[model samples]
Target chain A: DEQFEEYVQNFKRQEAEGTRLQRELRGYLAAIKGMQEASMKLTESLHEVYEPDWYGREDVKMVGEKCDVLWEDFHQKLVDGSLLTLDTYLGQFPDIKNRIAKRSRKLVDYDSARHHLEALQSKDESRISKAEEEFQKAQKVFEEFNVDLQEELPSLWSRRVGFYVNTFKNVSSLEAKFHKEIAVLCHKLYEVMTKLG
Target chain B: DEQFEEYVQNFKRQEAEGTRLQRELRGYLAAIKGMQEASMKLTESLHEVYEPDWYGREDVKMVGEKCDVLWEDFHQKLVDGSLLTLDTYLGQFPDIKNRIAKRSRKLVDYDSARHHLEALQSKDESRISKAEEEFQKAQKVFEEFNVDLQEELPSLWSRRVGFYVNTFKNVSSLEAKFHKEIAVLCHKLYEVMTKLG
Candidate 1:
């Protein structure tokens, strides 16, 4: 019960933190979509505004195509690289997280089982100097499982951090590459105008 | 009085329309701000993702800075050119719009005055349609002011189109130029990235 009381506190705190992280992930996806819409509208406005007689009409049209690609490439890379991996890592979380509760539950069975075994042994009040009496083979087995369960949560919680670091590093790396390429593409479009001038 | 009574109906309709237009303008501004924040955070993620050891580190940094400017510039243009012009064109509607109530109020005054005038003018069974009455003089002056009040709403509703056209033209022209310019910039960036490679 002491073990459950302590680890259970950690369980709720860690679960809430996980929920927050997942929510932020959803927010990230939502933000991406909102951004995508705003960007497209802006670009569409350009098409409507561009007149037939405009200089670089071909390029203007071409850029709309390119704009589409730029947007496409970025989001695809985000989902495939960052979001996909993010989801899987979190997928692993509920698994480990569910097990956290499971281990606690298992420990509960083991603890209560141990309590029963003790009661059974002590219920015979006439027994003398009971150190020599085996604490029931059931007590021995329950403790082995309970002890392992205690280590399980700490191991998994610490394990969660490594997975998080992995997610952070991947996103960090992917976006770096994505933006660098994005910049290069934008500058390319700008330089092309010199030919018209 | 009849003219004023009829005019009041038109005035309330116009007033509510003006109010709706103002509210829509506020929505556009709110959406843009909300959009601004979403985009900035999305971009911030990119900056973090860019690791230090990546190729084109300087260019990556430069693009991140440029991204902010891209957003900042367009919004300023929206405010200074389209939205600025758009708001004023929608402006001062209430003064003209409230004339429905005012027109009704004026009609009430004129009707009561006419009733009093008719009572005094009546003779011979108290039903005489009097001649040589000075009612024409008072009537003429009130008609002129009442006519002017009647003109207020129709003239404004019609007059707003010109300003609306001007605002539309400014933003339309801006987007054409802005989009073309942006594509040109992006392509230029792309070409430069080739240089680094």
Candidate 2:
């Protein structure tokens, strides 16, 4: 019990941190979605206003198309590199969290049954047998869950370091790359649009 | 009776077109705001996650700060050049629209009163007075609005061409520049953050 106590506390903290990351990652995705839409609207406005035969019309269309591509790439990278992994990490937590509660309850049941059987007259054969039977079942179920977690928890906790580092690395690297790419696209569009001046 | 009919038709068309432009432009501005925020959040995520001592720390911050400037300048230009002008263009129309409505009603009353008097018995008590008063009052009201708009109407029409062209050109140009520019920055960041590997 004490072995996984520290492990449990650490697991809870790590879980919280993971949940926060997952939640924040959701917010990040929302922000990306919002900006993508904003950019699209502004781009569509350009296409709407630009006359078909105007000098910059083709250039404007190219810019609009490229914007969409750039945005999709950015969003795709976020999902691929960060959000999906974060989601996978969170996906495993809910079941274990429930099972942990179940195990805790079952341990209480196991203790209560033991007390009942001990307090009952030793010759009350049927009742003692029932209590003994119940206690064994509860103990077995609780141990099964604990044993499963005992095998998994330590590694999951340690893996947090690498996973967090990699998530950050992948997202930061992708974000920087996309920003620089979009910046160059802007430069091209700028030169092309200079004709409008 | 039909003197201002063509003028009214032309004004209505111009007014409707102006309204659409204003409405759509406001939407465009809102989109710019939304996307600016979206992009800002996306970049901020990069800055937040990148380690302080990381190779791309300065570069990430640079990207984030430049994003703000880029976003602010893009929005400010729209406000200063296109949105502000769009507002001004739209501002005068509402009053004029109200006046036009009032003028149409008065014209209706003038005709209705004439019809009533013409079909009345000759020498009906105050019929001439009634018709004369109503017609003159309606006349005065119509001209009050008409004269207010007349001196400015031609001038307004003449200005519309340049106003429309300038707004169209400026907005399209800025949008393309920002789009292309963002792509460039993303490419730069891609290079900078690439050092992480």
Candidate 3:
């Protein structure tokens, strides 16, 4: 029971950590979108003021279009690869959490049954036997849940590392690829702009 | 006078364009700051979640610090190179604009003097001479301002292209460099994270 209590505490901690990851990851996704809008505006301004006769004016417009594509790709990847996976992982918690609550209730019932059987008088043999049978059944049901959860909780808790690793790895890789492509576009734009003298 | 009016219209267009560029650039700068703060929080979340014994925990922490430096550097460059240069270019406008207004008032006075002289009677020799002298003087002053502005306005307008080219070139280059470095860090972080199995 003490070990089960510890496992429950671990599950709670893991739950909190997963939720935090979800919130922060969503925040990061939002930030990327915001930055994309800002970047779009900035590039659009450059394109707007560029004269028709200006060297590389076409290139400026092209760069803006490429940037849009890159941003959209990055956003989609984060949604599919990182956010969806994290959401699915966190999704597992609520069901297991409900089951934990049910287990606790079952334990309470098992205790209630045992107390009733113990309280039966020595002369009340008929009722005592019936009460004992009820107690055994309750204990069997409680232990069933308890044993399963004792195995499941720690297993789920241990999965946190892998989840974190996968989440961050996916995000970081997507970021790397996005930035690399964007940088190339920016550099192309910069070179064209420089030649406009 | 008609040519002067046309030049004035061109000056107005240039002034509006410069102002618009300034406003848009500032908005972009503010957006960058917002993005920086969001990015900082996202990176901090990752670092916080990374376990002490996790492989490349130190690298995660290091990447976060490097990102901070790169963002600061990028922001500062945009301020100094692009924003300040743009601000200074726009700064030339108000004084020239004031001179343009003054020139218009002088033109009005010149017309008033000429009209007064023309209306004088043939026999009013004394008044005619006085009015003619005044008319000549007003014309002289108006032409001085008009002549100067005629030269200055076109010159300033032409410089707009160069100014815009410089501003956007600086911004784009800084963005390219920033993204390039950030991409490297991200790639490094992603590699470390992948090995966390």
Candidate 4:
């Protein structure tokens, strides 16, 4: 539950940062668009004023001057907005770096957990190998006992030998129980990898 | 060899166009940078004239008026250069448009070749499938004879069956040959996408 809460909080923080970035980008785009429009209007006005055919139109000349003034003002505003956008964009870099560092810390924790799980599995494997060796030694002893007594064996002795064989098989059954426990540990390792790594 | 010669000519043409575009872009960037610097200097000079720190410095007052004159001149130059840069930048648009159109035409040619190759592959696949079906039918007949006949059967019997099988196999082999040609066409498509598209 704590892990889930941490994940949700981080996601919300990232979303907020993203929204701020989008707003800054939109402002920058709007300013640029306004600047372009002002520039176009200024160009058209200048063309109309200088053309010989437009010489008789005094209103056009006055309008051209007004447009030129507006163009200058818009250009200044555009530069101011651009500078502000650059500053705002750069300011977010540090916060992004901090988020990356937090993610890295979680990765380190997951790595340590994986290492511990691997060590536990290796220990279980060694224990199973030792149990197998012990079972094989016990089987060899029982086989030698049957071979030496084969000529004089009685029907009742055969039944006793069968019980010993069954007992020896139970060693393998115990190893199987260890295997099932290891499988449970493996599933836990998989869950941790999926959720954190 | 004809294809290689065409590639060489195209490369030269592209190199020339790229150099021209780079030179034009550099001129535009430089003019804009210079005008921005001049504008900043003019703004600074105007601020100094209006907000002098000294209480009774006659020399500072004279300097202020001188700065005002210089600021006015600099502002005029900034306005002129700004207009000139916009005109120069826009004037090159026709050349840019032409280059883009030429590149687009080359891309269209490549796409047409790719489509043509795909059609050829589809035709080959159909032919190969038909040939395979015919070969399998012939094989079944030959196998039936093998099961019924003895080792003393005439060599001509086997040779004739082999010949029919080989004919169908050769049709499939021709389809494989076309695969190599299609691969070369696809390579040309990749080159076109990289260089133009």
Highest TM-score: give the candidate number: 3
Residue by residue across B7-35, what tens digits does model 2's lDDT show? 66767766776777776677667766766
Model 1 regions more than 4 Å off = A1-82, A89-197, B1-18, B51-53, B117-141, B162-169, B172-197
Model 1: per-residue Cα lDDT over A49-164, one tens digit each = 33453445576567557756765776677677766765665565566556655555555555555555455454555442252143354456556655765776666566654444
Model 3's chain A TM-score stands at 0.93
lDDT tens string, model 4, B84-183? Answer: 4434534544554454445445444544444444444545787566665655655554444333222312322334233322322332233233323333
Candidate 3 per-residue lDDT over residues A149-192, each given as its tens digit: 88899898778778788777888888899989899999998889
lDDT of 4 by residue, A132-156 (tens): 5655655555444434333222322
How does residue B109 of candidate 3 score in lDDT? 98
List the candidate numbers ranked by lDDT, top first: 3, 2, 1, 4
Write candidate 2's Cα lDDT for A1-197 as tens digits. Answer: 68878877977887887776776677667766766776576566555545455666777788779877988988888887688888888788888788878777877887787777654754677777777788888888878887888877798887875576567667756765666567666556656556664
Q: Stretches of candidate 2 above 4 Å error?
A: A1-3, A45-52, A102-144, A183-197, B1-10, B21-25, B28-81, B98-155, B168-197
Question: Which scores better on DockQ, 3 or 4?
Answer: 3
CAPRI-style grade of the A/B interface in model 1: incorrect
> What is model 4's DockQ versus the real complex?
0.01
* lDDT of model 3 at position B126: 76
For residues B15-38, what per-residue lDDT tens digits would candidate 3 score against the true structure? 887788888778777777876777
Error of 2 at A140 (Å): 7.6
Q: Put the candidates in TM-score order, highest first.
A: 3, 2, 1, 4
> Model 3 Cα displacement at A12 (Å)?
1.8
Q: Write out the backbone clash pairs for model 3.
A: none
